[PDB]
Amino acid sequence: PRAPRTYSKTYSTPKRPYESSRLDAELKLAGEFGLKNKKEIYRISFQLSKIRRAARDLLTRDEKDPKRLFEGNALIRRLVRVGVLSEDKKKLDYVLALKVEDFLERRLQTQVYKLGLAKSVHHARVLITQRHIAVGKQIVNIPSFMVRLDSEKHIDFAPTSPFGGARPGRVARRNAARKAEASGE
Amino acid sequence: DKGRFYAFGRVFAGTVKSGQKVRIQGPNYVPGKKDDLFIKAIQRVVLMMGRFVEPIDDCPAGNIIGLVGIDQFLLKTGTLTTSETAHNMKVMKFSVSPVVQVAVEVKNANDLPKLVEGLKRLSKSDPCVL
Amino acid sequence: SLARAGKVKSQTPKVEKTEKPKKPKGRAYKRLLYTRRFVNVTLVNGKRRMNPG
Amino acid sequence: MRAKWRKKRTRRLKRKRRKVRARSK
Amino acid sequence: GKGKPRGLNSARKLRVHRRNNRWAENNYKKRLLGTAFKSSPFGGSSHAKGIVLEKLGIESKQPNSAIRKCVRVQLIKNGKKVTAFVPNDGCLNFVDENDEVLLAGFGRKGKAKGDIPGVRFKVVKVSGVSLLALWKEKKEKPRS
RNA sequence: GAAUUUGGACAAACUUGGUCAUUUAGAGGAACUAAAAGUCGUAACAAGGUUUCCGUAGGUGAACCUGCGGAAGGAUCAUU
RNA sequence: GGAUAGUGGCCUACCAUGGUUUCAACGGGUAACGGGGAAUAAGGGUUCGAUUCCGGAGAGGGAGCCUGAGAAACGGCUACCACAUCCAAGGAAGGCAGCAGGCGCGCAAAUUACCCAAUCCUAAUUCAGGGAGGUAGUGACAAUAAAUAACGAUACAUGUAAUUGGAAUGAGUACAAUGUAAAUACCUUAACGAGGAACAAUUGGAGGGCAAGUCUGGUGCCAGCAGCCGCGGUAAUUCCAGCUCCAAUAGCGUAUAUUAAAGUUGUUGCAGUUAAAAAGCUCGUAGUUGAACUUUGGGCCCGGUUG
RNA sequence: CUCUUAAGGUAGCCAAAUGCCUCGUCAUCUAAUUAGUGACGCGCAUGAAUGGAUUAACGAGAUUCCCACUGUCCCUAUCUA
Numbered sequence A: 001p002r003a004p005r006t007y008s009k010t011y012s013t014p015k016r017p018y019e020s021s022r023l024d025a026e027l028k029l030a031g032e033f034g035l036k037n038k039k040e041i042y043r044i045s046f047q048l049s050k051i052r053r054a055a056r057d058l059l060t061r062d063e064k065d066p067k068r069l070f071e072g073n074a075l076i077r078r079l080v081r082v083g084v085l086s087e088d089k090k091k092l093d094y095v096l097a098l099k100v101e102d103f104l105e106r107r108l109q110t111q112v113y114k115l116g117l118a119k120s121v122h123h124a125r126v127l128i129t130q131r132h133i134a135v136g137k138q139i140v141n142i143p144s145f146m147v148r149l150d151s152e153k154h155i156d157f158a159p160t161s162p163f164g165g166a167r168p169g170r171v172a173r174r175n176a177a178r179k180a181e182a183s184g185e
Numbered sequence B: 001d002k003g004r005f006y007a008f009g010r011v012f013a014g015t016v017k018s019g020q021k022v023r024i025q026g027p028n029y030v031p032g033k034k035d036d037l038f039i040k041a042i043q044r045v046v047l048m049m050g051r052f053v054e055p056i057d058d059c060p061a062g063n064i065i066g067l068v069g070i071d072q073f074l075l076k077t078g079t080l081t082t083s084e085t086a087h088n089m090k091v092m093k094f095s096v097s098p099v100v101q102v103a104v105e106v107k108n109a110n111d112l113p114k115l116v117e118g119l120k121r122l123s124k125s126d127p128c129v130l
Numbered sequence C: 001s002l003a004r005a006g007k008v009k010s011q012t013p014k015v016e017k018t019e020k021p022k023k024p025k026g027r028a029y030k031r032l033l034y035t036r037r038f039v040n041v042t043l044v045n046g047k048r049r050m051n052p053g
Numbered sequence D: 001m002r003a004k005w006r007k008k009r010t011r012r013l014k015r016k017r018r019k020v021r022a023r024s025k
Numbered sequence E: 001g002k003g004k005p006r007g008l009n010s011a012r013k014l015r016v017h018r019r020n021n022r023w024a025e026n027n028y029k030k031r032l033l034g035t036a037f038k039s040s041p042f043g044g045s046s047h048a049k050g051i052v053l054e055k056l057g058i059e060s061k062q063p064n065s066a067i068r069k070c071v072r073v074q075l076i077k078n079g080k081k082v083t084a085f086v087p088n089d090g091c092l093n094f095v096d097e098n099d100e101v102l103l104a105g106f107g108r109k110g111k112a113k114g115d116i117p118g119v120r121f122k123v124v125k126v127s128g129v130s131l132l133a134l135w136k137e138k139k140e141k142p143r144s
Numbered sequence F: 001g002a003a004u005u006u007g008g009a010c011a012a013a014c015u016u017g018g019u020c021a022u023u024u025a026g027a028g029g030a031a032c033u034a035a036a037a038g039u040c041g042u043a044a045c046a047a048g049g050u051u052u053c054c055g056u057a058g059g060u061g062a063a064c065c066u067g068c069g070g071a072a073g074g075a076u077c078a079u080u
Numbered sequence G: 001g002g003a004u005a006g007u008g009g010c011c012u013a014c015c016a017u018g019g020u021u022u023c024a025a026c027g028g029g030u031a032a033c034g035g036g037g038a039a040u041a042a043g044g045g046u047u048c049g050a051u052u053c054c055g056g057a058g059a060g061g062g063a064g065c066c067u068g069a070g071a072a073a074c075g076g077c078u079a080c081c082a083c084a085u086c087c088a089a090g091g092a093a094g095g096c097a098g099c100a101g102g103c104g105c106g107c108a109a110a111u112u113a114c115c116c117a118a119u120c121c122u123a124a125u126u127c128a129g130g131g132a133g134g135u136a137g138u139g140a141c142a143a144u145a146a147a148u149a150a151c152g153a154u155a156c157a158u159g160u161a162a163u164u165g166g167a168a169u170g171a172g173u174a175c176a177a178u179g180u181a182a183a184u185a186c187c188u189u190a191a192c193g194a195g196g197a198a199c200a201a202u203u204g205g206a207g208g209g210c211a212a213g214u215c216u217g218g219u220g221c222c223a224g225c226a227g228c229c230g231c232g233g234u235a236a237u238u239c240c241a242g243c244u245c246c247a248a249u250a251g252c253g254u255a256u257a258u259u260a261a262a263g264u265u266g267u268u269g270c271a272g273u274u275a276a277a278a279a280g281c282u283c284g285u286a287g288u289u290g291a292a293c294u295u296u297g298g299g300c301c302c303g304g305u306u307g
Numbered sequence H: 001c002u003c004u005u006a007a008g009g010u011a012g013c014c015a016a017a018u019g020c021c022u023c024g025u026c027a028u029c030u031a032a033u034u035a036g037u038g039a040c041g042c043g044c045a046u047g048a049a050u051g052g053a054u055u056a057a058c059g060a061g062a063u064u065c066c067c068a069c070u071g072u073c074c075c076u077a078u079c080u081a
């Protein structure tokens, strides 16, 4: 038969399902970043756990060892590109010392709000899911993008999606059609 | 074959199709509320003949056909419709009634499930047996 | 003895449903929870409380 | 039951079992 | 010296001792002897259809009360007779004598649960319709 | 050079018998567990009203009783 | 010596008594195909691996065989064993553990569809064939992203009320066009497609574990709840419901198996006086283990790697 | 709880070569069994060196069943002295 289609999970439920402090922190993050449910927090903490495991393994590896050098420099390069890790912390220890907010700030849902394109984080989410924000020549209608810190200067509305483009919309078009009626003609 | 018991019946309006969503009707199904109406469909329409069957695709109203894929949800009789306010037709009262009644018991107690299946397999074969 | 299988569920008064506004399913529900719990609206009862008396 | 008397009763039971199994051949 | 050999050439002794002492685990011994196949009427499976034979009222163990209204069921799989709880408030009206019911475990891997004596299985479906959805007003059991 | 055929080896398979393994019926007998608000006594927990317990033997409706040796987990760490 | 493709007790004639084994032979069991691997995973481990790859075996059970480079072949044959089709009773034809499909068994699993366009295979061979294979149908196995609303004004107290308004989109439906072998769907889309946006999110819970009611009506050790502890016998925070609220969320719960938890299998790393556990005592084979001791220290260089 | 003995049949065993009722009851053996065997036992009237129970081996001892075998028989016939 055809080769198996490799797929992996992207999240992991907590060991204790009903921890008060963890539930309160998760709700804090969900409210402050306009997230649909705890699944986003779980996914981002799982991916961060992958990063922490990798960084721990490379730290236990010898310093200046070629494998450590190559893999660590790659890891900081990816993190500084995606914008989670700052430019002045290229030592692989701050990679361990990263946090969930450091990764949730780089969501497109967060960048579009921090650029003033929306009035709230939830307004940002709905504007995104309504295909209104385009990065370059590419409409991106999903909250989580992990902008690479170069798309930040290009995050704007689309030629479509009638806030920064040509057409007037759908409900606007029908409202025009019915005010044409209301005018008498 | 034990337990398919093709569905002999007459169509009066509309057409049947092999693979058609139908609303089977209970003998006591009140159309107002939820009653013996089930949400399954037909598997194959058949024109019945002399102890061998011919599969058919369609028949207009006023025709006599057998159905493959039902009687495992309706016991004795009823109608099959597709409209929403379709009252089932009359109960088809007969001149005879079950008056001869005898007790039935299996002599091997370990094979009772076959017996219970048999009593509900024969109650649907013959229209009069109760 | 048998035949009492409906002593409370069946033969005691049955209050029916009540027309109520729909909840804002999803991210809207998460915002509702965030505002009801973490903007310090009057439900604290000292440290934390989530139902009236 | 004292464990001693439980053991004694069990031994008597075992002797009865041995007798019945000796009868049954 | 801690009562077990440490020597570098004692691997066989250590693994033989571990093999001998692993028989004291109930789970390991059950898995190796295949008890769930010979005993435990469900043939190493959580699920099984069976045929009800009688409705019974079983008195709960002390200090409890309120007989649990279970049913004796004849398994179609192998032919054993097992008593099964019908878990809901009431809900015995929806299971009739000589009716087909699906049986599942009762939560304790055997080890009859709660105050119900000698009942290690519960009813999941009756006549092919869900027992829970039949306790609720969602569905109705077919006429039988 | 077909059919037919002599002697061989490979051998399915059948009968009978033996042996082993796994399920399984069985008059009857003797156990265990659960539910108990059953009958009988009170055997143990206080020196539990005969201190308790172990091994062994015998006996008794039943717990149990008794002989023999042992233990204190005894009711004695105690008589220069 | 025979036979083999050749080696070989592979078989045969003579000869001697050899060969394996407590370092487990032989025998028994396996719900045992093995491995690359998988789940869980501080380390060490434990369990699974019929099933996408590799090797093996088989084609209802054996056995035998022609052809053929290659078969002990089975969509080949021979016969026996059990089934089993047809019959005009004389005969003839069999092996879906291929694709579908059907019965049965079940806890348990899809269409008697389309096509060689992709990948490759066979020939005499560019061309034909291919239920190999791909495509579609069924699919809440599993896995990924994330719709169910967002913003004003007004009224009131950063937020609330059946107080109202303008925007935005897809869930759909669908010309075309793309997608394809013709396709459906996916992406982009003319027009239609929001106002209780009814275009209405559910699954389990609210004593503890474990987040969430001493709310109300019912019930009165009844019905029932409860994985455990436990709740009900007229004040039930636990039942049946109503209201409110909690957790996860297009998923949640239930049952079994396994892993971590389990330092409750302990090699790392368990315990043994009283909780379960030192054999009544000693010898002793196998096994395991077992005192120290033999070239060290100087000095001179060549010369590496890190500040 | 009584009446009552010297003691009131203990361990064992039984419709037994010992049980009337009786062809006892159940099971098995057969198509069918007053037979046989295994059980049960308020056992007319079992029972402990008047020995109780069980026993390998042995028996021209009594009984039941099975294989084989055959004129015992169906059903008789023939031959020799």
Ligand SMILES: [K+]
Pocket (backbone or CB within 6 Å): E063, E064, E065, G221
């Ligand atoms: K109680």
Ligand SMILES: [Mg+2]
Pocket (backbone or CB within 6 Å): F042, F043, F048
């Ligand atoms: Mg006493």
Ligand SMILES: [Mg+2]
Pocket (backbone or CB within 6 Å): none
């Ligand atoms: Mg005493």
Ligand SMILES: [Mg+2]
Pocket (backbone or CB within 6 Å): none
């Ligand atoms: Mg005493």
Ligand SMILES: [Mg+2]
Pocket (backbone or CB within 6 Å): F049
């Ligand atoms: Mg006393």
Ligand SMILES: [Mg+2]
Pocket (backbone or CB within 6 Å): none
């Ligand atoms: Mg003790």
Ligand SMILES: [Mg+2]
Pocket (backbone or CB within 6 Å): none
């Ligand atoms: Mg040679």
Ligand SMILES: [Mg+2]
Pocket (backbone or CB within 6 Å): G032
């Ligand atoms: Mg196998």
Ligand SMILES: [Mg+2]
Pocket (backbone or CB within 6 Å): G032
């Ligand atoms: Mg394996």
Ligand SMILES: [Mg+2]
Pocket (backbone or CB within 6 Å): G033, G034
């Ligand atoms: Mg394998």
Ligand SMILES: [Mg+2]
Pocket (backbone or CB within 6 Å): G050
């Ligand atoms: Mg298998």
Ligand SMILES: [Mg+2]
Pocket (backbone or CB within 6 Å): G060
């Ligand atoms: Mg087959």
Ligand SMILES: [Mg+2]
Pocket (backbone or CB within 6 Å): G075
């Ligand atoms: Mg074949």
Ligand SMILES: [Mg+2]
Pocket (backbone or CB within 6 Å): G148, G200
């Ligand atoms: Mg909706």
Ligand SMILES: [Mg+2]
Pocket (backbone or CB within 6 Å): none
């Ligand atoms: Mg709490």
Ligand SMILES: [Mg+2]
Pocket (backbone or CB within 6 Å): none
């Ligand atoms: Mg409630």
